[PDB]
Design an enzyme around this catalytic site. Structure first.
Site, PDB file in Angstrom:
ATOM      1  N   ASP A   1       0.845  -1.194   0.000  1.00 25.62           N
ATOM      2  CA  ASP A   1       0.000   0.000   0.000  1.00 25.62           C
ATOM      3  C   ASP A   1       0.881   1.245   0.000  1.00 25.62           C
ATOM      4  O   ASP A   1       0.597   2.211  -0.713  1.00 25.62           O
ATOM      5  CB  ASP A   1      -0.931  -0.018   1.225  1.00 25.62           C
ATOM      6  CG  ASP A   1      -2.032  -1.083   1.120  1.00 25.62           C
ATOM      7  OD1 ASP A   1      -2.295  -1.589   0.009  1.00 25.62           O
ATOM      8  OD2 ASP A   1      -2.592  -1.460   2.170  1.00 25.62           O
TER       9      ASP A   1
ATOM     10  N   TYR B   1      -9.205  -1.215   1.390  1.00 27.05           N
ATOM     11  CA  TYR B   1      -8.745  -0.928   2.749  1.00 27.05           C
ATOM     12  C   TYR B   1      -8.871   0.516   3.062  1.00 27.05           C
ATOM     13  O   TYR B   1      -8.703   1.385   2.191  1.00 27.05           O
ATOM     14  CB  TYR B   1      -7.246  -1.212   3.013  1.00 27.05           C
TER      15      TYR B   1
END
Ligand SMILES: [Cu+2]
Ligand SMILES: [Cu+2]
Ligand code: NA
Ligand code: NA
EC number: 1.4.3.21
Lengths: 621, 621
Positions: A290, A374
């Site tokens: 990420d 997320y």
């Protein structure tokens, strides 16, 4: 002006112009990363020097470049053509959001797979999923994205409720080719919706929650100067923001009497990766960095008052570059506030007759980011007593799959037909230490059990041992919760009044580290995640534990290459890299949107002060 | 009226009268413990039956008694003379606070030791320290206390700053004899004061803390009925209070739709012990069972508004018995309030365009107690999402000693000459489980690493395994942080909509357990503390992990005797006993009064619900 101030729009505009005036920001270029560099060691005598580092992609197929510009001087400092097969591909571009879906939508293999499943292509969402490095030789040196399908029944439907399992595709972004379409067979697409704002799923909303009002009638106890310098309850620091790392804290120091004492020179989350533990070939390649692949700062949310940050909030709105070098602000992207934190210290003494109670508080510096499914909140806390803590709050919607009809050792069931593959979320905190200055060392401290016998006849004794990590080859450490293992960062040349070296102790949560087989691609590309603690000697080019270009980089980059230098870390300028993460076997309660779960670490003073640093806290009014 | 209501003054008065009317509460008796008993299993059809259990000491030297009285009926149910050499001595009496000091003050050996050190006996404080069981045969069957000296320079001085090392004494309380005075030699008494309210030590008080105001303009979201029944955000429970255990929670249940679903039948801290790791004979006997020897409820503090509990607080003022059977109230001894707890769930979805954020809150039920130098806050939290958590906050003043001039492997330095011996604070939470009712079982869940190879060619797979604990002989478990070990309590006869058994997962902190040698007296008397998790079959007489009479009890009582029954715990009425603690190597920052440190555990639903139980939480105003 502080060399650690946040980038201003004007600085971004000047970088654009320099890259332009210098000929590196053509019409066909795309900025994949832009950020201000920190000041070089010691260079901060007293002199302006703002440099920006930029990664520039080329959509025409030419080689990308890494460029460093001085905006102070209006000059290009260095510009290097990158060979991506060697040093990695550039971070995923926001403009690639829709490209995988668009390329697949005209591919006959993809359409054949959707048609077999009676899915309307106009309703099939596909994300730019990072590719990693696997068995496909055609991908080496090419910018590849992979794609998994999720059905949206209507435009406001949660596509995560409707994963299309048994199907995956790979795309060459620059050539606009679909390299492969893999169809392992038809799985039912889960039918139930996951629309957590639909009254049919939520039920009538609760009417029982009475308001909780947090106010500061005289305003906050911290000050903000020069745009991002914080002073609060003896703490001093600068709040930075980088498009990759997000909020970064610089120059964390504590005013003990009339001395400003450094503690941490830079603190950041320098990488965060989500490896998946489903061996299906539809997902077994998936590991989302990420931070390093997607850039978590870029996707920082604008935070709504009374909703995301409650109380008396001071916001920063950091400026980043778009793909063309135009500045843009992330409005209300960083929250800063102080919070009550319960009891600080309390004692009721029978002999003295004195009853004493004091309350604690913490300074909070936070942001929230979204990467696909997320959403994570990154929180730094500074406490009155000198404690420093980081907490990640993981939420969002879980990444879904089919639930196999015979059950699964690697996927949990969420709803009929709907699965959630197992995964971890693993962070690396890079802490460039400066305990009372830069001359620091790290000791590993274990509890020591003692045997009943001479010198310990009642068998009650226990002790502690500290082992100095002297060189980088020795400084790759694992947790030992059973023996209360912690790591102490000290300054061997700075002693407290008891003639003991001043220090801070890192308390980890001792959560599992990377579970993948050590021979796996992910174990090689995210080697940092296989061990809880690494210590390196500071180098200005050693920024991320996974290296500079994470996307499709072969195994081996970052920390395991850095520590091969086997440098002296005993009383030197050092960096602690702490791995910590959550291992997630999703529960039914995580569906259709997941309650927050947390992981983090803290550092507490250990003989840093000459006595409690909070004796001057007054009784609460 | 609820059979779980708090004891009223009237009930205590009736017990006094019954013990009187029955002839068991003479002039020479002292009540060492009095508490209401919980209702027997199933007995709660619909019928009043309040029984109290009482431990009665005799200062004239006769045998003590355990007595159970029915206040509903005005009758003595059972009364048994205790042989203390066999079953243990009774808890330390508040009236013994000053007795050790008083007895020593006229002893020629004690006076000789003080005179050698030029200490004024009128300034020497001595506590009733518990004795444990060691090599002294004269102590078996006698009520013994030990005593260590601390100098108070003036009446409001902190005596902890001035420990008198090298000296300890033992006392027979009933005979009023000083059995032994041990003097191993003269250590300097530390000179500096530790008076944390003295401006010379605190410095000028901070003027920088601006107020933080937490208010609830429409009042709190919980209701309190029948004196102690709480209803809050779907939770239902009863708040009990016992002089030994402190706050106890009964009937923890969650209203899922129109079904009240039990979760935990009783939750308490059933023991807490502080073992010391200093092998000096002056202290090597010391292990303070704050709960079992001293009774933590008895010393619950009266909590001051705006100081100890901030916001909109509802207090309970529990009633206990004094030594004579007179009721007395602990005014404002229990705080109950709800707190904002940050973000509950959040997701910003690119495909649906929906941005969603919800806030969390917790219900807090708390008390603070003081035992000698220690002060602890015990906090139970109930969260919106179904999570249950306990947190202990340890503060007070550290127990001190001399700091040896050559340093120490078992004591840390706090100030010149002043040491703090190493110790642990270890708790046992007794959780009488009732997940969807009483038919429960416990599984141990470990992460499972998988080898790269067939079925896992990319080496990414990972899994989980669950092992049912079927009988008590199998149910004594240790932590394994490295493998993410947790324990799941489920109801094998109650399934969620996915046909999986409903459950809750216990997440421990995986702190070190009891460090003492396994052959030690403390390892035998606090055997519970040597393992992280025990599971027993419910029995109404199995209340404490250390047994009923902890004081001077030989090794072997409590859990290790209970589990010898090797009872079926697979789908039965069971009790989980979780050991958790702090291992404390005191720091300079802990002196002269220590900042709070924390330890605890939580339980999170695991397929207990059919989907997130918080979809009906509305957006914040
Ligand atoms: Cu997750
Ligand atoms: Cu302690
Ligand atoms: Na450093
Ligand atoms: Na039970």
């Amino acid at each position: 002006a502080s060399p650690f101030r946040l980038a201003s729009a004007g600085e971004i505009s000047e970088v654009q112009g320099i890259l332009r005036t210098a000929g590196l920001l053509g019409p066909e270029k795309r900025i994949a990363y832009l950020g201000v560099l920190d000041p070089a060691r010691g260079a901060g005598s007293e002199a302006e020097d703002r440099r920006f580092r930029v990664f520039i992609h080329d959509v025409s197929g030419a080689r990308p470049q890494e460029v460093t510009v001085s905006v102070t001087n209006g000059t290009v400092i260095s510009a290097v053509e990158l060979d991506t097969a060697a040093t990695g591909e550039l971070p995923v571009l926001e403009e690639e959001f829709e490209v995988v879906e668009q390329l697949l939508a005209t591919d006959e293999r993809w359409l054949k797979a959707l048609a077999a499943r009676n899915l309307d292509v106009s309703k099939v969402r596909v994300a730019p999923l990072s590719a990693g490095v696997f068995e496909y030789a055609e991908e080496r040196g090419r910018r590849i994205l992979r794609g998994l399908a999720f059905v949206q029944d209507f435009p406001e439907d949660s596509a995560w409720a409707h994963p299309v399992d048994g199907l995956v595709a790979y795309v060459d972004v620059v050539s606009k080719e679909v390299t492969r379409v893999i169809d392992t067979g038809v799985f039912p697409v889960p039918a139930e919706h996951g629309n957590y704002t639909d009254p049919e799923l939520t039920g009538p909303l609760r009417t029982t929650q009475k308001p909780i009002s947090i106010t500061q009638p005289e305003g906050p106890s911290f000050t903000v100067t020069g745009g991002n310098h914080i002073e609060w309850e003896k703490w001093s620091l600068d709040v930075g923001f980088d498009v990759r790392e997000g909020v970064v804290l610089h120059n964390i120091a504590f005013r003990d009497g009339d001395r400003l004492r450094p503690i941490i020179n830079r603190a950041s989350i320098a990488e965060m990766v989500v490896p998946y533990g489903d061996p299906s070939p539809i997902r077994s390649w998936q590991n989302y960095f990420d931070t390093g692949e997607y850039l978590v700062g870029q996707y920082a949310n604008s935070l709504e008052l009374g909703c995301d940050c409650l109380g008396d909030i001071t916001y920063l709105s950091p400026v980043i570059s778009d793909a063309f070098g135009n500045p843009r602000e992330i409005r209300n992207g960083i929250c800063m506030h102080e919070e009550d934190w319960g009891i600080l210290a309390k004692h009721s003494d029978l002999w003295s007759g004195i009853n004493y109670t004091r309350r604690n508080r913490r300074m909070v510096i936070s942001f929230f980011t979204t990467i696909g499914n997320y959403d994570y909140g990154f929180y730094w806390y500074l406490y009155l007593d000198g404690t420093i803590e980081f907490e990640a709050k993981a939420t969002g919607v879980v990444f879904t799959s089919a639930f196999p009809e015979g059950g699964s050792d690697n996927i949990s069931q969420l709803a009929p037909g709907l699965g959630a593959p197992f995964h971890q979320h693993i962070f690396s905190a890079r802490l460039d230490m400066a305990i009372d200055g830069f001359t620091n060392r790290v000791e590993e401290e274990d509890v020591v059990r003692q045997t009943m016998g001479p010198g310990n006849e009642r068998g009650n004794a226990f002790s502690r041992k500290r082992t100095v990590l002297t060189r980088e080859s020795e400084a790759v450490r694992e947790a030992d919760a059973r023996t209360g293992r912690t790591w102490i960062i000290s300054n061997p040349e700075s002693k407290n009044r008891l003639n003991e070296p001043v220090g801070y102790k890192l308390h980890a949560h001792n959560q599992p580290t990377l579970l993948a087989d050590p021979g796996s691609s992910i174990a090689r590309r995210a080697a940092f995640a296989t061990k809880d603690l690494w210590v390196t000697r500071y180098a200005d080019d050693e920024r991320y534990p996974t290296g500079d270009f994470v996307n499709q980089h072969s195994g081996g980059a970052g920390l395991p290459s850095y520590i091969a230098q086997d440098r002296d870390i005993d009383g030197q300028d050092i960096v602690v890299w702490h791995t910590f993460g959550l291992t997630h076997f999703p529960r039914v309660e995580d569906w259709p949107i997941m309650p927050v779960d947390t992981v983090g670490f803290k550092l507490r003073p250990e003989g840093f002060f000459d006595r409690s640093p909070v004796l001057d806290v007054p009784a609460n009014p």
